[PDB]
Amino acid sequence: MEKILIFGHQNPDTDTICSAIAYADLKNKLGFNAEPVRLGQVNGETQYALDYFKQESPRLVETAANEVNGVILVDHNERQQSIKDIEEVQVLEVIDHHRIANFETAEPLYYRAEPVGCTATILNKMYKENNVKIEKEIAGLMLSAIISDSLLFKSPTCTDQDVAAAKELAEIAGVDAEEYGLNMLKAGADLSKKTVEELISLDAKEFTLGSKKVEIAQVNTVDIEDVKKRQAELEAVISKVVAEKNLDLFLLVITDILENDSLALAIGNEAAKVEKAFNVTLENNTALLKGVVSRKKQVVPVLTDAM
Amino acid sequence: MEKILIFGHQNPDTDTICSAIAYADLKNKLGFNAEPVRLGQVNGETQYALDYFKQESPRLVETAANEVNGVILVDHNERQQSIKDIEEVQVLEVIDHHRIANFETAEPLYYRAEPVGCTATILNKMYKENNVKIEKEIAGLMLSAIISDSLLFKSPTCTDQDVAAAKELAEIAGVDAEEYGLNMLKAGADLSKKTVEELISLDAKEFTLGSKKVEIAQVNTVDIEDVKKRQAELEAVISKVVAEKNLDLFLLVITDILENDSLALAIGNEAAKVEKAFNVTLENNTALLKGVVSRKKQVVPVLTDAM
Numbered sequence A, B: 001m002e003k004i005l006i007f008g009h010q011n012p013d014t015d016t017i018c019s020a021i022a023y024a025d026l027k028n029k030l031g032f033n034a035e036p037v038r039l040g041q042v043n044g045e046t047q048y049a050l051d052y053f054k055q056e057s058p059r060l061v062e063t064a065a066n067e068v069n070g071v072i073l074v075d076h077n078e079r080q081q082s083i084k085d086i087e088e089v090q091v092l093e094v095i096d097h098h099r100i101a102n103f104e105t106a107e108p109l110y111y112r113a114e115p116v117g118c119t120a121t122i123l124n125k126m127y128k129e130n131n132v133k134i135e136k137e138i139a140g141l142m143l144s145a146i147i148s149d150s151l152l153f154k155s156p157t158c159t160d161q162d163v164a165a166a167k168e169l170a171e172i173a174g175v176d177a178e179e180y181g182l183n184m185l186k187a188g189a190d191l192s193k194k195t196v197e198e199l200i201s202l203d204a205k206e207f208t209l210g211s212k213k214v215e216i217a218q219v220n221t222v223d224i225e226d227v228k229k230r231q232a233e234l235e236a237v238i239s240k241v242v243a244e245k246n247l248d249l250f251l252l253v254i255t256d257i258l259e260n261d262s263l264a265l266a267i268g269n270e271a272a273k274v275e276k277a278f279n280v281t282l283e284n285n286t287a288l289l290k291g292v293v294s295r296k297k298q299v300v301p302v303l304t305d306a307m
């Protein structure tokens, strides 16, 4: 069997990593010579899953032309998202779940995209279609990918198929879908292992709306509780920054990526402007901003018009 | 259910007509509201199949945006091949077997392309995958599509899957794959309903190689037998032409488009030049010219350097 390289997009998500490993397995079990490969660094989320299921991190690669003549794309299809020298190899097949664009083939191929929330959901169909038993080990990676892409079935893109697939895989992998999922999701930005001065600095941008000096920092977690439990220390560091930068307002936006609601911690003179722009009542400088997940589209415009 | 329109490319081939009808059936049996549609005239090959299995010719359409919001594409994906106002509707899904190009979607969709020789081969998988019984009537249309696209399994694109599918469908439809196939393929161009003087003129070009007056006519069939059985009448009309035009050689090249071999019927003084240039032995003025399919590239250059 000519050798094939299977891999997902750049800036690898858990789907791009796990699905590549998963399909490579399926392919090999069907008599081919395939190897899972990644095009970037494996993030914490992915890691937790790889480690939990004792799986080797797919080999890093910069180009494919030098190793093979044909490749298989998973979780993507647009050129920019693919390998660097993609123009120089033949896309044998694509297993994906996104729009189709900036993609084109000179020859026919096995393209299989479905309107589901995760590439793994599709593979799972393919395993059964080819009647190939799924190893406990990999089923977990697949289950991981689904959880990852569907934000634990809470994602707007999640589907009844994704959910039924996750359930099915979680049993085989001998785990509890939601239980394992939360842990994995958590290992994402692991804030529990970060300084209170670190959180207030990650995604922080300063503005000067209405002649007032302001700073809005955001932090994404799968449980606002993890970060609210440390409000004392947060207020401390925030108050410091407010002093050093002579800020009229410092708005920390603690977003729950699962429930799409984000808790706000406003410290400043214009801390009342957060109560106006979002129509809320700050009680301990903490008010739940419902439905707010983006500050560029939901926070900045509503506060600019509040002052 | 929102209404959907299912259709193939323009200048409709039997795959584009039958697969559109077939998949609309599958879709309806699964609870949707779909209608098979065509973008052009139904040719003779397709007709024979439609009539044989008592099936109505899918409705002619010029645009879709006015009727529906979503469409399903079968047997194609490149814009130019699709409907006129394709840009104005949403491609819900694509069941196809060609390269992907000049195609792009804003949203995700169900895209399913396989490296087989016919769109119907894929539908057949899909019927079983969804466990839906295939009505005798439509199985025939699917069988037709496969026969049409694979030139009775002789096509270079034909696959083991296409043949296995044709067999399976042929039984259900209660017919003999190759028996019905030939009749259908024949109804395409149809040489059995053409004058012997008509065949020798479809594609006849005269040359004057080496000071000698010559004429080479070509005829493409799916069974040289259909044309050889009428050799008596052929030689009669050829000999007449040879007399009226004072030809030193009239070479009729009867090409079998299935086997890519073409039988030669040479009548003239230089009738031995065909024996030299092709390295053969004329027996009854008929010798099999193996591998010869083009006269511009394979007959003319080898006969010019022979006389």
Ligand SMILES: [Mn+2]
Residues within 6 Å of the ligand: A009, A013, A015, A016, A075
């Ligand atoms: Mn992805």
Ligand SMILES: [Mn+2]
Residues within 6 Å of the ligand: A015, A016, A075, A097, A117, A118, A119, A149
């Ligand atoms: Mn994905």
Ligand SMILES: [Mn+2]
Residues within 6 Å of the ligand: B009, B013, B015, B016, B075
């Ligand atoms: Mn076609």
Ligand SMILES: [Mn+2]
Residues within 6 Å of the ligand: B015, B016, B075, B097, B117, B118, B119, B149
């Ligand atoms: Mn076709």
